[PDB]
Amino acid sequence: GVFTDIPISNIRRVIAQRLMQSKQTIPHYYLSVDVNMGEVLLVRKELNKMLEGRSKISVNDFIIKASALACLKVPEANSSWLDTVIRQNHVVDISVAVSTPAGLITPIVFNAHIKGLETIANDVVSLATKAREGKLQPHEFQGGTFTISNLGMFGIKNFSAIINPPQACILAVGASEDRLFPADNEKGFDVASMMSVTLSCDHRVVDGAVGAQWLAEFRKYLEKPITML
Amino acid sequence: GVFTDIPISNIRRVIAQRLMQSKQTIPHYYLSVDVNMGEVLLVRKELNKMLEGRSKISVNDFIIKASALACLKVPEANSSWLDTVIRQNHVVDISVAVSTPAGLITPIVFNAHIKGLETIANDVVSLATKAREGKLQPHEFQGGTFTISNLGMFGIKNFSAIINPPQACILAVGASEDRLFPADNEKGFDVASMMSVTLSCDHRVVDGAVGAQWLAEFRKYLEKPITML
Amino acid sequence: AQRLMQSKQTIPHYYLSVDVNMGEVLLVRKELNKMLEGRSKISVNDFIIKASALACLKVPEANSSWLDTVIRQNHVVDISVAVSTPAGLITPIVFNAHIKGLETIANDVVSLATKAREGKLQPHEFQGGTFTISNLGMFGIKNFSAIINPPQACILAVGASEDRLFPADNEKGFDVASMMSVTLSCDHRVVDGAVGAQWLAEFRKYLEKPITML
């Protein structure tokens, strides 16, 4: 025929009310900056060489570590509005979003401000075995104080997601491309890799100047990785 | 005096309630990509040569054809949320938006997945005679399953429109500019034309990975037009 | 043997001919098969089915049928491709060839070879159609002239792609090019001389520049 009618399952029945609660109440406003990823690609080149056989370190692992350290400098991006109490947290719990064919479910990486890179890289892979094959506990994917969502593996340059209702921030990462800049070369130009980031704050707990300094710290760690020490 | 008071007519009285219904209920989220338009400009150069006198083919005609073919590969961007039934359509009905001095009215191009380019180009022009001179039937501009809105004729690089309430997607096209890329030239760089596109999905029926593949197909047709066959 | 004798006695056949430059089709299917790796393969007998279905829309009198009181004019192109089994000559039907793309037709021609050669056809799958393409270029035949199906008004007949040479504006004076010889066979009761000569003027024009198919 012309149109085909499909009933609604119980997974999307629950998700569709979390989305409508989030957009009606929370006054979103967006921010943007682009990050030079030229020095991360030379660090993970030789960290994977010294760490042969055991594990592998990806570019989505430096982003989880740099986000947990930047929330300690500016702690207002780690809060929650509870209509009477701005609950300020001291523990960073990054909820990485991953995409299954069944939907969009977010495993949680607890205590991301004390763990090293190799401990996180074996947590992201080991929770892909849990989430994609349906072995999650209800306390393993519900919670957290922050959220990173990545769509750079599909070619998207920018997007702007929807904040989890108790949380105040979310991140949104584009795809790493190849641009060129004016330099002090004899030619006049160099080539460099770039990456476009889009924060999405809650305006009730995060002002304009506060969230603009979160992206000033997040840019500074990923441009020189030695500063993470 | 200081301020001048104007009453509200019955055209903007109806539009202002469609807008407020759309933003309150639908949880929008945005996406973006840029498209190389270097090979479309060499096809419409010599299609207008072989089609002398009769009609003229514009760059806003390849976009209507590439959008109707991309909805067949990824059919979830062609649905509708009806609070109990996700009505999935099999017929693509693109509603092109045009701007009159009286307002913003959207003529409908029916069955855009079977028509050729010359049939669409004589439908867009012939509906400009209908819409701008006020000869539309109520079933000629109300309906459709998709929407393309173009503002590249004013210099806007990016924008993000508002979805029609029954529909799930909308498109938003910037203006074709002239950038330059690093190449394998002896110099090191080439010059190319680009164009910036901004999708705006409904998050209740379209996930993140689904809408990111719609822009992966839409980019692929307009970069090599022979793939449309 | 009774369908053949009915066809030649009643229908007053007359033949037509033209040759088509296939130089630009071979550069399109070279890079369509590159972008379509693994899934399917696009042959030169697939552009001919698509160009024939589009040319019947420009000149609709080559798509009719004589019924002795009514010239039934059709609006739906149903090309009946003829294929050769060891059991005989049977014609699977490709329905609605004027809206389908090239990859949809190429997976219909192969999938009906599984049906027809292995004997799994329904009687409504090979009986009908409004047009007929018959190809013998895989045996070296340059020209032939087939027999029209009795309700239908046209048939096509394709030769083998050879290599000729033409006078050009070269410094040498000549270039080399690939050619292909086509032979239409009309029914003179519904198709005149000037009408069928414009069908081959459109069929030649699509296959010489494939971008015109859009």
Residue numbers in the entry:
A (entry chain P), B (entry chain i): 1 to 229
C (entry chain H): 16 to 229
From the paper:
Pyruvate dehydrogenase complex (PDHc) is a large multienzyme assembly (Mr = 4–10 million Daltons) consisting of three essential components: pyruvate dehydrogenase (E1p), dihydrolipoyl transacetylase (E2p), and dihydrolipoyl dehydrogenase (E3). Mammalian E2p and E3BP jointly assemble into a 60-mer icosahedral core scaffold with their C-terminal inner core (IC) domains.
To investigate the overall architecture of native mammal PDHc, we have extracted endogenous PDH complexes from porcine (Sus scrofa) myocardium based on a conventional method of mitochondrial multienzyme isolation. We then collected 11,575 cryo-EM micrographs of purified PDHc and processed the dataset with single-particle analysis (SPA). We thereby masked the external densities and conventionally enforced ortho-icosahedral symmetry to determine the IC structure at a resolution of 3.66 Å. Within this reconstruction, adjacent IC domains are compactly trimerized to form a dodecahedron vertex, which visually resembled a tripetalous, pyramid-like structure with a height of 70 Å and a diameter of 80 Å, reminiscent of homologous structures in the cubic cores of A. vinelandii E2p. These twenty vertexes were organized into scaffold assemblies through hydrophobic interactions, with a classical double-handed manner.
